[PDB]
Amino acid sequence: VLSEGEWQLVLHVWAKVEADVAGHGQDILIRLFKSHPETLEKFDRFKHLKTEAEMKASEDLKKHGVTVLTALGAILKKKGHHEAELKPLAQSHATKHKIPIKYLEFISEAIIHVLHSRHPGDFGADAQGAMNKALELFRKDIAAKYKELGYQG
Ligand code: HEM
């Protein structure tokens, strides 16, 4: 459970992210796809994208970045009370998209890398520690629902 002090650190950086959701989404998804190429193969709509420059130029990729960060922000702002938000997401990513829990660890590390690049002063070690904890909670609740449905991992 995150303390109230840790939630403040998370949401304080997230307000910055919300200044430019689209730029953030894009960096995060390009980072994910470059670091872990096997993740790009889950997206039929992005599989044709071969270079970083092509990724940077795709308007549809930038659109999906916004989609992702908007659903994440809606969860983070629940400060743990995110049951109604998390449960449709787990259901679809387990049963429809077929995303292993491991890829959610990957995209968490991408989110932390980009936050660190764009917001030093607001993302020191204490903030980075609270953001990790939040993402771990997110991943742990998703994994419980995966397990239920018979996909755990
Ligand atoms: C920070 C974690 C993530 C969030 C909040 C999230 C959120 C979303 C949302 C809200 C949608 C659209 C509605 C739906 O179909 O459920 C979606 C679709 C999708 N997500 Fe995620 N997702 C995340 C991580 C991942 C990862 C890591 C992968 C793949 C490596 C992934 C693959 C997909 C796919 C394949 C689609 C459908 C794309 C299409 O429209 O063709 N998601 N995700």
UniProtKB/Swiss-Prot annotation:
Residues annotated to bind O2: H64
Entries under PROSITE patterns matching the protein: GLOBIN
Amino-acid positions noted as binding nitrite in the UniProt annotation, renumbered to this chain: H64
UniProt KW keywords: Cytoplasm, Heme, Iron, Metal-binding, Muscle protein, Oxidoreductase, Oxygen transport, Phosphoprotein, Transport
InterPro entries xref list: Globin, Globin-like_sf, Myoglobin
Primary residence: cytoplasm
Catalytic reaction annotation: Fe(III)-heme b-[protein] + nitric oxide + H2O = Fe(II)-heme b-[protein] + nitrite + 2 H(+); H2O2 + AH2 = A + 2 H2O
EC number in record: 1.7.-.-, 1.11.1.-
Keyword Plastid (UniProt): no
GO cellular component terms, A-Z: extracellular exosome; sarcoplasm
Localization annotation: Cytoplasm, Sarcoplasm
Effect after changing G121A: In metmyoglobin
Binding residues for heme b: H93
Modified residues annotated as Phosphoserine in this record: S3
Gene Ontology BP term (one): removal of superoxide radicals
Gene Ontology MF terms: heme binding; metal ion binding; nitrite reductase activity; oxygen binding; oxygen carrier activity; peroxidase activity
A Pfam match: Globin
Keyword Transport: yes
Domain of life per record: Eukaryota
Residues annotated as domain Globin: 1-147
Modified residues (Phosphothreonine): T67
Subunit structure: Monomeric.
Stated role: Monomeric heme protein which primary function is to store oxygen and facilitate its diffusion within muscle tissues. Reversibly binds oxygen through a pentacoordinated heme iron and enables its timely and efficient release as needed during periods of heightened demand. Depending on the oxidative conditions of tissues and cells, and in addition to its ability to bind oxygen, it also has a nitrite reductase activity whereby it regulates the production of bioactive nitric oxide.
Family to which the UniProt record says this protein belongs: Belongs to the globin family.
The protein's name: Myoglobin
